[PDB]
Amino acid sequence: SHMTIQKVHGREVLDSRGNPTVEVEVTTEKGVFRSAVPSGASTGVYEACELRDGDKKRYVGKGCLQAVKNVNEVIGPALIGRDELKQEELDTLMLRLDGTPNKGKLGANAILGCSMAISKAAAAAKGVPLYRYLASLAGTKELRLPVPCFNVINGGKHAGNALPFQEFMIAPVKATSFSEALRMGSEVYHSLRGIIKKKYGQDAVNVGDEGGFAPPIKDINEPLPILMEAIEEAGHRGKFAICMDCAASETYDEKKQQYNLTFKSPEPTWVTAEQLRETYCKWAHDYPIVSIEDPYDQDDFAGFAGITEALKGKTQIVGDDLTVTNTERIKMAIEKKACNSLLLKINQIGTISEAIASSKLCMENGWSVMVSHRSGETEDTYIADLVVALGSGQIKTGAPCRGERTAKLNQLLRIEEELGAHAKFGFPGWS
């Protein structure tokens, strides 16, 4: 009993947009283990419940006092005296404490902080770093440092501009270490600022939620030549690929069954799913686009399947809102061959055990796994250890700008250093 959970305490803290979120400390004899919960803006309809207070007098209703109370008064007292090494057991206990399919009673934001902190307490109990401990939980045979996929032109709900599609990313796929990958990413980002400033002017180089540039662009094609120019100017021709996140659900009108390419503007530009496939095929041909995430609405399984088959072997199709890190949605995606990459978001599902199960299910069926931040992030670095632990080779955790993004990139540097020069880097299919 001396080695068990001694204290569990939740508190409301701010995320990188200044919105409240939940952080949890688990205390054991080995110390205080702290994990914070991120928060999406373009949240899928099938995501586990993010519980907010709705008190118009605090943060216009975005308080997390109820989720914090649920940690302090409900979940915490159940965990005291328990063996933190029993990850599946404690995650299952919290699932049953909640008793609902969507974590709508306690909140996925109450449960996840606990799940995360338990795993860190356990890693400390074993006397191994978090990535090592999580690797054992996941049965991972080979750790690797991931290629970082840097969202450097921000759009959608994340900026700032007319641009309807959410994320335009660069990934140093030909780097041979994480150190080099991160430096190359930063150098291109710096070149990109100069290019954007020259083309669009001073007022164009302020940043979006994920640290990417938020230039005054409307056209979804327009960022792509700019990315290639920055890659070239920084001295890294040939070393980079492009990744997209369309977040296409956010533009979609269910009644009209079409996508609004100008939803942040006074007048609409209605576009069909077929008009989109033509665009995606053109993108994949004109540029080294190796990954397109959420190219269609979150329930367009047929659209997803069509593009997955069309770009088979050239461009992975990533489910994010389609799959919501959830084995049930993933099984539907597998059955329909809807996509071949999982965007893994721990807070889409709400426990470490379930997120791990989702990764394993995806990899067993031949998919890649891209571990992911949310657009509302914290100083928390859990996903850096998690992506190494899963050996997936792919992470997106922001542009190389803003501390809630660079904290993850830096933690990856520290892990790289621990593992030494024989540690694998990158995603083999892209190298």
Instruction: Tell me the binding residues for phosphoenolpyruvate.
Output: 41-42, 345, 374-375, 396
Residues in 248-307 that interact with its own copies by CB under 8 A: 264
Among its own copies, Zn ion, none, what does residue 141 contact (CB within 5–8 Å per kind)? none
d(CA 343, CA 336): 17
409 binds its own copies (CB under 8 A): yes
Q: Which of 208, 295, 303, 319 binds its own copies (CB under 8 A)?
A: 208
Among its own copies, Zn ion, none, what does residue 1 contact (CB within 5–8 Å per kind)? none
Q: Is 56 a catalytic residue?
A: no
Each residue of 113-126: b (16+ CB within 10 Å) or e?
Answer: bbbbbbbbbbbbbe
414 binds its own copies (CB under 8 A): yes
Q: Which of 100, 102, 206, 275 binds its own copies (CB under 8 A)?
A: 206
Which of 358, 371, 363 lies closest to 409 in space, CA to CA? 371
Task: Select which of 345, 354, 408, 416 is catalytic.
Answer: 345
Tell me the binding residues for substrate: 158, 167, 293, 320, 372-375, 396
Question: Which tokens in the block code for residue 115?
Answer: 């799940």
Among Zn ion, its own copies, none, what does residue 58 contact (CB within 5–8 Å per kind)? its own copies
Which of 175, 173, 137, 174 lies closest to 391 in space, CA to CA? 137
Among Zn ion, its own copies, none, what does residue 414 contact (CB within 5–8 Å per kind)? its own copies
Nearer residue to Zn ion within complex by CB, 29 or 278: 29
189 binds its own copies (CB under 8 A): yes
Instruction: Please choose, out of 81-89, 185-193, 317-325, 349-357, the segment that lies near its own copies by the rule CB under 8 A.
Output: 185-193
Q: Is 345 a catalytic residue?
A: yes
Residues in 160-179 that interact with its own copies by CB under 8 A: 160-162
**CB of residue 335 vs its own copies: minimum separation in angstroms?**
39
Task: Select which of 23, 25, 50, 210 is catalytic.
Answer: 210
* Residues forming a β-bridge with 36: 23
Among its own copies, Zn ion, none, what does residue 99 contact (CB within 5–8 Å per kind)? none
401 binds its own copies (CB under 8 A): yes
Among its own copies, Zn ion, none, what does residue 410 contact (CB within 5–8 Å per kind)? its own copies
**CB of residue 347 vs its own copies: minimum separation in angstroms?**
16
Which residues lie near Zn ion (CB under 5 A)? Answer: 2, 29, 42, 245, 320
Binding site residues, its own copies, CB under 8 A: 11-19, 23, 31, 57-60, 159-162, 182-183, 186-187, 189-190, 202-203, 205-208, 214, 216, 235, 264, 377-379, 381, 399-407, 409-410, 413-414, 417
Catalytic residues: 210, 345
